[PDB]
Design an enzyme around this catalytic site. Structure first.
Site, PDB file in Angstrom:
ATOM      1  N   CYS A 170      -6.999  -3.154   4.093  1.00 51.05           N
ATOM      2  CA  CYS A 170      -6.749  -1.719   3.960  1.00 51.05           C
ATOM      3  C   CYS A 170      -7.452  -1.148   2.717  1.00 51.05           C
ATOM      4  O   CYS A 170      -8.458  -0.421   2.823  1.00 51.05           O
ATOM      5  CB  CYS A 170      -5.263  -1.347   3.995  1.00 51.05           C
ATOM      6  N   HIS A 172       5.076   5.482   2.411  1.00 51.98           N
ATOM      7  CA  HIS A 172       5.184   6.722   3.165  1.00 51.98           C
ATOM      8  C   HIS A 172       6.120   6.561   4.370  1.00 51.98           C
ATOM      9  O   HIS A 172       6.736   7.567   4.791  1.00 51.98           O
ATOM     10  CB  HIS A 172       3.816   7.239   3.632  1.00 51.98           C
ATOM     11  N   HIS A 208       0.618  -3.444   6.733  1.00 51.95           N
ATOM     12  CA  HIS A 208      -0.657  -3.325   7.445  1.00 51.95           C
ATOM     13  C   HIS A 208      -1.846  -3.888   6.670  1.00 51.95           C
ATOM     14  O   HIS A 208      -2.965  -3.842   7.253  1.00 51.95           O
ATOM     15  CB  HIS A 208      -0.879  -1.850   7.828  1.00 51.95           C
ATOM     16  N   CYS A 234       0.857  -1.190   0.000  1.00 51.12           N
ATOM     17  CA  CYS A 234       0.000   0.000   0.000  1.00 51.12           C
ATOM     18  C   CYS A 234       0.894   1.241   0.000  1.00 51.12           C
ATOM     19  O   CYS A 234       2.009   1.235   0.590  1.00 51.12           O
ATOM     20  CB  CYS A 234      -0.903  -0.041   1.267  1.00 51.12           C
ATOM     21  N   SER A 281       0.735   3.756   1.903  1.00 53.88           N
ATOM     22  CA  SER A 281       1.134   4.146   3.261  1.00 53.88           C
ATOM     23  C   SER A 281       2.420   3.429   3.727  1.00 53.88           C
ATOM     24  O   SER A 281       3.139   3.987   4.569  1.00 53.88           O
ATOM     25  CB  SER A 281       0.029   3.888   4.297  1.00 53.88           C
TER      26      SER A 281
END
Ligand SMILES: NC(=O)c1ccc[n+]([C@@H]2O[C@H](COP(=O)([O-])OP(=O)(O)OC[C@H]3O[C@@H](n4cnc5c(N)ncnc54)[C@H](O)[C@@H]3O)[C@@H](O)[C@H]2O)c1
Ligand SMILES: NC(=O)c1ccc[n+]([C@@H]2O[C@H](COP(=O)([O-])OP(=O)(O)OC[C@H]3O[C@@H](n4cnc5c(N)ncnc54)[C@H](O)[C@@H]3O)[C@@H](O)[C@H]2O)c1
Ligand SMILES: [Zn+2]
Ligand SMILES: [Zn+2]
Ligand SMILES: [Zn+2]
Ligand SMILES: [Zn+2]
Lengths: 374, 374
Positions: free
Chosen positions: A174, A51, A67, A46, A48
């Protein structure tokens, strides 16, 4: 049997920002009271997780990220009642304790036990279950799914259908749930409305799926990468626009296209400027704009409050507004009954050992979701 | 007989910013097609009229201000069907044409024929009905109530009960309806909730009235002028706080008082800083904040979008969200049936010739609403 014993396994450790992940041996402690140790089966890449590498999303390093995942319970700590060894599970990056004021509210889902607002990178008890090279390693969002084995608190895991295909339903942890819920639960998109979706990655495609499911008549996809348009149209976009093709700002273009502003807009990128643009393009008296993207840490946006005074509504949400532990099993049941599709989000599959190539694919613009298998 | 003739009468003309109103003779033309000429009976002094004087609210000058009023129809132009000579009426600073996309939407009220977004200071036809000393004088929000006679477009006037007391129901033309509706229609305050109201003037007291009517359990008034607290408690505040009494930011105080953030907050002042404070003090996962105050022209606020990502909702509205022409007559009927009170908002009743003294009472902090009687 490994119950009650330390497990040595491989994980992807991030020692430093802006560096490749290091696939190496870690030690995973056994679960304490109200904890669950999970053998991971599949995890998605993902934005994120990226990030964390870029420093956009600040959490303590060194860390085991990940996650969006699914796996099988290896063992349970004392007092666990909601899962058992052998069950298929999805880790919940947003917990559901069931006891705080948020969990008891009809609409809220941002449980006060979260590790999102002011991250510690630990279990609920403030300690870590991971060591690497003899050094304790942080957790990420209570989940840490980039590892052959992880340990999670009971309030951060949901039991799912035993017949679930884990290489698909990991996306319910997610990207799918976030985008779909942002449309159907947070915005509450209406039948016959006009929607604009900024960002056409895995989460933005899931927002399009939700807008179409809600009966929208027009769904305008917005992305600076025109290679994302074909798949957006396959899942329900009626038109796509690239801001780089225009001499005027895209909020003006979208307001003209919608004969005075859109009913619902969604920011699904993570930029301060597109959050303000997305708000401006919704109709000034009755429009609704939802922030989904995560922007660079601690940065403020500038906006004119007259955009709100006329009547606009501006909101954001985590995980599509879903109460996580109640919702994840129901979303998996709906997937098994063909109520929504996940294959349109999956563009690439790789073994876990090729995690860095999977991040390269995301960063180049080529992929939507790469699924990693353990 | 005045019908079909130019009327010479007294008005309060504002020739330039930051000067007293000039009370002098003006000429008021007869109504053209679809226009209504009204003999004014009572008008309130609202902070938005003062914003024209101070330069906070930009509109063409010279001008006849005033937007909160009630009067009696003197004559109608060709084609008027909704009012007749002798009817009691309230001018509508937000029009209701009934035919635009906003008027046809279930929730919206910011009619596209408004003169608020990009003010021209004219009638709908782009001309003015007022002259003073041989010069053209601008209209204000299509209403211009600081004159013995005004001319308004039909879509900017509502007929009301013939038995209503005009010196009271003029407040339904702005302050009462705005505050009450902001609570009951825009925020949709719930039974048992905790509310925070920033600014305890005529509009903020009306927000308190609406929160109490909606069944809130706790209503916290916030003002830097503690002389406003007694009246706030009389109309439903359970507690009042002055930010100047505290060593920490009031958003932190209010979060602690409410055991983690309020359900609903309202900015009813007009400052960028209190808009962001009001958002911050509502609960991060499910709180709602409504902007009612009008801040200085062309100034942007700065805020962290993580305030919204957790789950907060931020919105604003004009005139309490009420569709103006449909709602004003019903609000008057509800007043006549004793469903709400207006007397608590009225601290002073003066002749129109004392308009400047009335503005000084507002600026000094000594009044809530002054009603001016012609
Ligand atoms: N709120 C939540 O609970 C939640 C959970 C899911 C992910 N996230 C966030 O959602 C966002 C989307 O995640 P994803 O995995 O779909 O990401 P992604 O990188 O796959 O997709 C982002 C898309 O934005 C487009 N884009 C980039 N800059 C742009 C610009 N200036 N204008 C227009 N388009 C632009 C890209 O080309 C890309 O297709 C990320 O910020 C992620 O961190 C939030
Ligand atoms: N949205 C709309 O449709 C609409 C219609 C009504 C009026 N308005 C606006 O509503 C606002 C309120 O109008 P009003 O007539 O009640 O004004 P008012 O001046 O009577 O009341 C404002 C109150 O704010 C308090 N205040 C000032 N600065 C403060 C600060 N820094 N912190 C805390 N309290 C502070 C004052 O002491 C005062 O009691 C104005 O900005 C007006 O222009 C908007
Ligand atoms: Zn909780
Ligand atoms: Zn994610
Ligand atoms: Zn209209
Ligand atoms: Zn007003």
């Amino acid at each position: 049997s490994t119950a009650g014993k330390v497990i040595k396994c491989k994980a992807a450790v991030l020692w430093e920002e802006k560096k490749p992940f290091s696939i190496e041996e870690v030690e995973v402690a056994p679960p304490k009271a109200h904890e669950v140790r999970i053998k991971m089966v599949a995890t998605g890449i993902c934005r994120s997780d990226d990030h964390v590498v870029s420093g956009t999303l600040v959490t303590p390093l060194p860390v085991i990220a990940g996650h969006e995942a699914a796996g099988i319970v290896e063992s349970i700590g004392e007092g666990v009642t909601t899962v058992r060894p052998g069950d298929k599970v999805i880790p919940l990056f947003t917990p559901q304790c069931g006891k705080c004021r948020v969990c008891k509210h009809p609409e809220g889902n941002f449980c006060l036990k979260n590790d999102l607002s002011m991250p510690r990178g630990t279990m609920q008890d403030g300690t870590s279950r991971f060591t690497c090279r003899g050094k304790p390693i942080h957790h990420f969002l209570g989940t840490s799914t980039f590892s052959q084995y992880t340990v999670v608190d009971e309030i951060s895991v949901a039991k799912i259908d035993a017949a679930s295909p884990l290489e698909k339903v990991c996306l319910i942890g997610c990207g799918f749930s976030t985008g779909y819920g942002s449309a159907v639960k947070v915005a509450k998109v209406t039948q016959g409305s006009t929607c604009a979706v900024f960002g056409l990655g895995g989460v933005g495609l899931s927002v399009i799926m939700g807008c179409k499911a809600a009966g929208a008549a027009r769904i305008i996809g917005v992305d600076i990468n025109k290679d994302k348009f074909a798949k957006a149209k396959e899942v329900g976009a009626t038109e796509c626009v690239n801001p780089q093709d225009y001499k005027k700002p895209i909020q003006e273009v979208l307001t003209e296209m919608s004969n005075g502003g859109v009913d619902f807009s969604f920011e699904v990128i993570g930029r301060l400027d597109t959050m303000v643009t997305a708000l401006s393009c919704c109709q000034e008296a009755y429009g609704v704009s939802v922030i989904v993207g995560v922007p660079p840490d601690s940065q403020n946006l500038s906006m004119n409050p007259m955009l709100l005074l006329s009547g606009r509504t501006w909101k954001g949400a985590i995980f599509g507004g879903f109460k996580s532990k109640d919702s994840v099993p129901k979303l998996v049941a709906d997937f098994m009954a063909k109520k929504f599709a996940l294959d349109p989000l999956i563009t690439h599959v790789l073994p876990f050992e090729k995690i860095n190539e999977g991040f390269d694919l995301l960063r180049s613009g080529e992929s939507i979701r790469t699924i990693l298998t353990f």
